[PDB]
Amino acid sequence: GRLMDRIRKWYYNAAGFNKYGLMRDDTLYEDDDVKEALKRLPEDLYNERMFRIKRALDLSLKHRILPKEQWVKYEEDKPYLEPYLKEVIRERLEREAWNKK
Amino acid sequence: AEPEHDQRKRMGLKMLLISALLTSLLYYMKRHKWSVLKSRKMAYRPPK
Amino acid sequence: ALLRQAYSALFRRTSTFALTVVLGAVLFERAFDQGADAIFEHLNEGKLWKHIKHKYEASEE
Amino acid sequence: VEHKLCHSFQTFNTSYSDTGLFGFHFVADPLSIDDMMFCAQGEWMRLCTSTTESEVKRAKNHLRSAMVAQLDGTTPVCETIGSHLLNYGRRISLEEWDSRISAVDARMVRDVCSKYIYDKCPALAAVGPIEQLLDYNRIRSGMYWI
Amino acid sequence: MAPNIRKSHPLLKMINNSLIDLPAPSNISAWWNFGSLLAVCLMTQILTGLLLAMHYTADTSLAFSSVAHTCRNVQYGWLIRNLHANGASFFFICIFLHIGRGLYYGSYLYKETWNTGVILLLTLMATAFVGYVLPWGQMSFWGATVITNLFSAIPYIGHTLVEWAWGGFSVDNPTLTRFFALHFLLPFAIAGITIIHLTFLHESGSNNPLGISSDSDKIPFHPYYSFKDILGLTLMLTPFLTLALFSPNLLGDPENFTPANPLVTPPHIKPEWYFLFAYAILRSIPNKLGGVLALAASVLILFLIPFLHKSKQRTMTFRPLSQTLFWLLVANLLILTWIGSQPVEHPFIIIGQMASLSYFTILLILFPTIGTLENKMLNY
Ligand code: HEM
Numbered sequence: 001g002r003l004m005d006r007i008r009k010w011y012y013n014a015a016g017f018n019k020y021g022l023m024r025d026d027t028l029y030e031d032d033d034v035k036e037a038l039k040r041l042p043e044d045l046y047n048e049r050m051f052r053i054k055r056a057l058d059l060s061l062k063h064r065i066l067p068k069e070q071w072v073k074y075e076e077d078k079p080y081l082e083p084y085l086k087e088v089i090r091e092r093l094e095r096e097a098w099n100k101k
Numbered sequence: 102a103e104p105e106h107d108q109r110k111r112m113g114l115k116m117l118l119i120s121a122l123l124t125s126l127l128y129y130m131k132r133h134k135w136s137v138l139k140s141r142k143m144a145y146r147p148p149k
Numbered sequence: 150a151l152l153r154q155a156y157s158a159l160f161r162r163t164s165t166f167a168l169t170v171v172l173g174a175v176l177f178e179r180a181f182d183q184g185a186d187a188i189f190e191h192l193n194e195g196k197l198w199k200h201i202k203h204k205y206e207a208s209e210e
Numbered sequence: 211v212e213h214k215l216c217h218s219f220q221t222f223n224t225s226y227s228d229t230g231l232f233g234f235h236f237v238a239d240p241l242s243i244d245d246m247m248f249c250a251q252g253e254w255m256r257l258c259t260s261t262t263e264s265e266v267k268r269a270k271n272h273l274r275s276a277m278v279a280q281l282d283g284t285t286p287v288c289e290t291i292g293s294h295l296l297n298y299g300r301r302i303s304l305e306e307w308d309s310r311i312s313a314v315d316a317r318m319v320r321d322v323c324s325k326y327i328y329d330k331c332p333a334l335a336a337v338g339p340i341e342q343l344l345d346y347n348r349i350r351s352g353m354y355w356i
Numbered sequence: 357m358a359p360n361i362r363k364s365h366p367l368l369k370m371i372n373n374s375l376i377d378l379p380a381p382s383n384i385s386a387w388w389n390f391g392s393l394l395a396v397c398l399m400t401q402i403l404t405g406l407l408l409a410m411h412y413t414a415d416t417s418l419a420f421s422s423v424a425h426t427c428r429n430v431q432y433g434w435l436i437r438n439l440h441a442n443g444a445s446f447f448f449i450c451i452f453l454h455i456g457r458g459l460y461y462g463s464y465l466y467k468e469t470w471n472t473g474v475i476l477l478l479t480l481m482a483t484a485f486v487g488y489v490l491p492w493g494q495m496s497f498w499g500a501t502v503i504t505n506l507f508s509a510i511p512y513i514g515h516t517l518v519e520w521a522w523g524g525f526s527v528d529n530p531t532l533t534r535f536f537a538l539h540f541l542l543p544f545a546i547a548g549i550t551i552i553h554l555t556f557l558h559e560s561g562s563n564n565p566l567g568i569s570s571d572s573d574k575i576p577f578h579p580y581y582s583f584k585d586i587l588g589l590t591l592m593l594t595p596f597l598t599l600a601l602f603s604p605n606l607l608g609d610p611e612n613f614t615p616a617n618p619l620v621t622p623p624h625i626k627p628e629w630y631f632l633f634a635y636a637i638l639r640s641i642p643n644k645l646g647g648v649l650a651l652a653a654s655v656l657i658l659f660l661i662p663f664l665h666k667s668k669q670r671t672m673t674f675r676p677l678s679q680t681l682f683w684l685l686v687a688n689l690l691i692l693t694w695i696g697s698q699p700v701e702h703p704f705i706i707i708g709q710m711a712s713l714s715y716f717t718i719l720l721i722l723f724p725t726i727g728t729l730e731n732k733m734l735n736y
């Protein structure tokens with residue numbers, strides 16, 4: 001029942017942030033949580049995430065995109081932050097419910 | 102109903118001329134300056 | 150070499166530059182209006198009082 | 211110093227056979243880069259606009275000592291000679307140089323700096339935590355009026 | 357304290373750190389020009405506004421004639437007038453683009469900057485509303501009456517609020533005069549808030565089309581955006597002048613060339629395009645009170661927007677689904693506008709109720725829902 005995957009992959013190309021050379025998690029809006037996770041990122045993964053964006057902006061300012069061969073691919077997108085994130089949300093969700101007790 | 106009529110159209114003309122010319126000029130200068138950015142090139146060269 | 154000569158005597162010192170715009174503008178006005186007015190009128194040949202004036206100015210009664 | 215602008219800075223006039231690089235280089239903390247640059251480009255300007263006879267008289271007496279200084283020993287002399295000939299063709303004596311220097315005056319400077327500095331597109335090398343230097347455009351405009 | 361003279365001057369430090377050294381994203385587009393435009397727009401209305409006010413006479417027996425005299429006798433009076441009345445539109449256009457932009461890029465996540473915005477809009481709306489009555493023409497008059505008369509739908513505490521607002525028992529001189537005063541005032545109040553608006557903004561900086569940290573690459577407002585801004589200005593000022601110099605009344609209804617007469621009502625009472633969409637929603641609900649509410653909420657709704665954001669991303673750039681829903685909404689306004697310029701007969705009415713019905717539905721249910729659903733397709 002590959003319905004789901006077919007969709008997720010579609011939408012993925014639909015949103016098309018790959019065209020900019022972004023990763024799903026790059027596009028993440030920096031709310032308090034995300035803000036935290038990012039700080040935890042290992043030097044390298046963080047420094048990489050950075051350039052990607054600075055690159056993307058430079059594109060958007062230029063009104064261009066990456067050549068089709070450089071776009072990212074649904075399965076090659078590395079969800080480098082999700083894990084760091086989930087945990088943050090887990091850590092917080094804990095604290096929060098404990099201050100109610 | 103609108104004595105001005107004429108003078109107003111005479112203006113429209115003048116306005117369209119200045120307008121067109123001054124927009125063109127500005128457009129150059131905008132591009133000119135911005136060039137620095139649109140021409141820009143960057144590379145990510147870590148220490149590896 | 151106007152571009153050169155210009156950049157030298159005119160657009161060089163922020164002073165002569167400005168001084169040019171002023172005078173320059175003066176000329177522009179003085180001669181932009183003429184053209185415009187002239188163009189406008191032409192597109193309205195004989196409709197303006199500037200034209201049909203000769204019919205009552207010193208020729209009646 | 212008044213503002214703790216940098217750590218160090220230097221004016222240099224590298225000269226090559228057919229070309230050369232004229233400018234300056236400063237080191238500084240990530241947050242004073244700007245003020246510093248600003249002031250520097252500033253001074254540069256002042257050069258083309260209001261350089262005084264006091265500034266030159268002093269600059270000359272400094273330069274004199276500096277030239278003489280390059281010839282302090284044997285090694286530093288052969289260097290000069292190895293160079294002078296190779297580059298200039300002949301060999302210039304402190305007597306020649308000096309006179310070539312005594313001939314300079316305020317008026318003369320403002321004209322030469324103007325010639326190679328005023329309203330010219332420059333080269334920029336930024337290295338390190340330079341988030342404050344930014345925009346060539348601005349840097350460019352700092353090449354006129356002061 | 358400092359070297360140069362625009363960082364150590366308690367004044368130039370405000371003309372600088374807000375318009376020259378101001379940190380701006382390097383990738384903001386044309387949809388960011390509306391900011392300054394909106395400003396410049398104000399700067400102008402106020403000016404042409406006074407220039408007119410210096411020749412106007414607020415009195416149900418001279419208002420019309422004064423405005424008329426202003427046009428026929430005052431040097432460039434007519435010109436100065438056009439510009440003002442048209443400046444009004446230009447103003448709204450810029451505001452609506454400005455607002456749309458904010459919606460399509462979640463700039464509304466800048467809560468304060470947003471709410472101040474909304475208020476600014478509200479004030480602008482009220483402002484025009486009064487300015488319209490001043491020329492005291494048929495439409496001037498009747499638009500007053502129709503609207504002000506809504507207030508009487510509120511229970512108890514309203515049947516009075518109205519006679520208080522009029523200064524009498526119907527829209528008459530007592531009103532005109534107080535409206536004029538109000539029209540003189542509000543613009544300033546707008547300028548005021550606008551200051552607060554820009555402040556809450558400078559507390560975070562501009563949001564950029566991509567919706568991701570700009571810190572990685574920001575440029576100085578000058579000359580980058582100061583230049584862009586001026587071009588943007590000209591690219592608008594052109595049609596503004598173009599219509600105002602070649603087709604003056606293209607926008608304005610004629611019944612306002614007929615001195616107000618409380619005894620006779622115009623065939624059709626309809627506002628200026630920028631109030632149409634609202635008019636249409638007001639008229640969709642048959643029940644003065646309800647329609648009033650719908651009108652209110654039709655604009656008040658904006659305040660909610662922030663609390664109705666569910667996407668893990670900010671701008672719609674990377675959210676196709678939302679985008680079309682967004683354009684469906686935009687077009688949804690066009691329709692409402694159109695429906696407002698039409699009478700109260702079938703099909704209009706039904707089309708009317710629908711459009712409005714869909715207007716709220718989108719901002720209340722679709723947008724937030726398609727947002728969530730969107731998130732899950734990213735697998736978040
Ligand atoms: C009273 C008129 C207003 C003026 C003169 C004004 C001006 C500005 C200016 C100068 C900016 C910065 C540049 C830009 O446009 O992005 C700005 C930003 C903004 N304004 Fe307004 N504004 C006005 C009305 C509003 C309204 C009615 C709203 C909507 C409720 C609003 C929402 C915003 C938002 C959200 C931003 C953030 C821009 C961004 O995303 O970077 N403003 N405004």
Ligand code: HEM
Nearest residue numbers: 401402405406408409412441483484487488490491540543
């Ligand atoms: C908030 C900015 C302003 C807006 C949105 C605005 C809008 C308008 C509107 C909607 C009209 C009706 C124009 C018409 O007859 O078609 C008008 C008229 C007028 N406004 Fe303003 N106005 C503004 C500022 C001002 C200011 C600041 C003054 C002076 C303090 C002013 C004074 C007048 C006068 C004298 C009239 C009546 C005569 C006329 O219609 O020309 N306006 N204004």
Ligand SMILES: CO/N=C(/C(=O)OC)c1ccccc1COc1cc(C)c(I)cc1C
Nearest residue numbers: 481485488489499500626627628631634635
């Ligand atoms: C005094 O009437 N002014 C009118 C106008 O369009 O001024 C620009 C006018 C003229 C005819 C009918 C209705 C109006 C006012 O209608 C309004 C006014 C405001 C504020 C809003 I929110 C919403 C609507 C529908």
Ligand SMILES: CCCCCCCCO[C@@H]1O[C@H](CO)[C@@H](O)[C@H](O)[C@H]1O
Nearest residue numbers: 108111112115116117119120593597
């Ligand atoms: C975008 C800015 C456009 C400005 C256009 C300036 C037009 C004003 O031009 C006007 O034309 C009238 C008719 O001949 C003359 O009577 C006025 O004296 C003259 O100032």
Ligand SMILES: [Zn+2]
Nearest residue numbers: 609610611624
């Ligand atoms: Zn009509």
